[PDB]
Amino acid sequence: TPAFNKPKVELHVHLDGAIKPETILYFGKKRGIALPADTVEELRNIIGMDKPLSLPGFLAKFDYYMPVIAGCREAIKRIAYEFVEMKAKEGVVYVEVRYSPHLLANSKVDPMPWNQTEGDVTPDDVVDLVNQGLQEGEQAFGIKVRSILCCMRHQPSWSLEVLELCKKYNQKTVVAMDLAGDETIEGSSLFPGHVEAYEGAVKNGIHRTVHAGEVGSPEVVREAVDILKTERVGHGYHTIEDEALYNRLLKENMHFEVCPWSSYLTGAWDPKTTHAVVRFKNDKANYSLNTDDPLIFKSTLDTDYQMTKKDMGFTEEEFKRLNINAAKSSFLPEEEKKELLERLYREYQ
Numbered sequence: 001t002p003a004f005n006k007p008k009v010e011l012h013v014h015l016d017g018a019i020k021p022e023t024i025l026y027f028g029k030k031r032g033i034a035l036p037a038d039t040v041e042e043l044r045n046i047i048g049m050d051k052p053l054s055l056p057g058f059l060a061k062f063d064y065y066m067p068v069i070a071g072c073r074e075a076i077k078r079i080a081y082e083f084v085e086m087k088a089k090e091g092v093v094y095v096e097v098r099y100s101p102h103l104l105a106n107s108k109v110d111p112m113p114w115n116q117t118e119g120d121v122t123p124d125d126v127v128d129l130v131n132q133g134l135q136e137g138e139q140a141f142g143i144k145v146r147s148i149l150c151c152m153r154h155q156p157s158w159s160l161e162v163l164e165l166c167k168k169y170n171q172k173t174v175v176a177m178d179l180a181g182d183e184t185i186e187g188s189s190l191f192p193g194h195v196e197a198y199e200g201a202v203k204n205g206i207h208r209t210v211h212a213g214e215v216g217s218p219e220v221v222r223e224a225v226d227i228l229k230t231e232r233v234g235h236g237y238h239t240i241e242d243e244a245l246y247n248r249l250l251k252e253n254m255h256f257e258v259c260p261w262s263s264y265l266t267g268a269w270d271p272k273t274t275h276a277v278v279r280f281k282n283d284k285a286n287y288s289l290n291t292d293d294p295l296i297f298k299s300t301l302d303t304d305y306q307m308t309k310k311d312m313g314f315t316e317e318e319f320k321r322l323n324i325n326a327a328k329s330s331f332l333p334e335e336e337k338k339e340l341l342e343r344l345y346r347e348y349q
């Protein structure tokens, strides 16, 4: 039985980290592009991981399959459509999917991702492609789906373009901007391209979220809050290491996008210590339960729910509480956010 068989809200899940192993094999074979496995089962086991590594070690899993999707219009729209079908099956009624448009493009991107040969798929085109797949999935499965464009920590020169994309496709699925990738790159939050992208988002009203405190120190979280001006913190487990900052953000009703199973495999969470989400629960903090990268973690949303339930002591009450919280902290407009809350209260009776 699912740990929580009722409607859910997900705010932290990556599109390029939520692809069907079957769809990956399809395009690898179709484009004649090398894959580390020839069957969907072998493919799952090599792309996937079931024991802790590091953030850089986990990020390396993308190198295996991205080449097969990147630069292929048909593939881009297909994974967006299929993502919606995956989530609907999980009991998710509203989802925000994040991804980097540049990492899927093969035209007007520098440096060229995955050694691709120049093509005509621009970062803009991929956003439009994802919009179409997500819209068709919304129509076909009856769940509300939005997107978040990711700035990449190591490539700040793409950040202002990501911002312009968020502006251009505002609410056309695109509801916010994120900062993702390798948090171990010292001071990456403060690169000028990133900083300028976010400041312009504040002045233009584009919503903001940032991965921080996943594997980085509380100072990375503080940088996200103070300089980048985030409205939500992706992961944020390490915040608790600085009592003052934690109690400040807690007092400020800051939303934490928690990914339980994910934190275990990236090493963000030391299994020898009590998970931060337990303290978040005990303090009644504003947080959500997320999958992050279900393809690589060989998981599903129920994975995270069982984890917190069997271990950690979560109840049905908290599950409803954190989901109403996730709905309130969504980057959805007031009219649509109101409709979502009506839905949860209706189905939580």
Ligand SMILES: OC[C@H]1O[C@@H](n2c[nH+]c3c2N=CN[C@H]3O)[C@H](O)[C@@H]1O
Pocket (backbone or CB within 6 Å): 014, 015, 016, 017, 059, 062, 098, 099, 100, 103, 150, 180, 181, 182, 183, 211, 214, 292, 293
């Ligand atoms: O979705 C865009 C990118 O975000 C990065 N990503 C995915 N999961 C994570 C992540 N970066 C940091 N932490 C993780 O939650 C990947 O490099 C993927 O290519």
Ligand SMILES: [Zn+2]
Pocket (backbone or CB within 6 Å): 012, 014, 180, 211, 234, 292
């Ligand atoms: Zn993430």
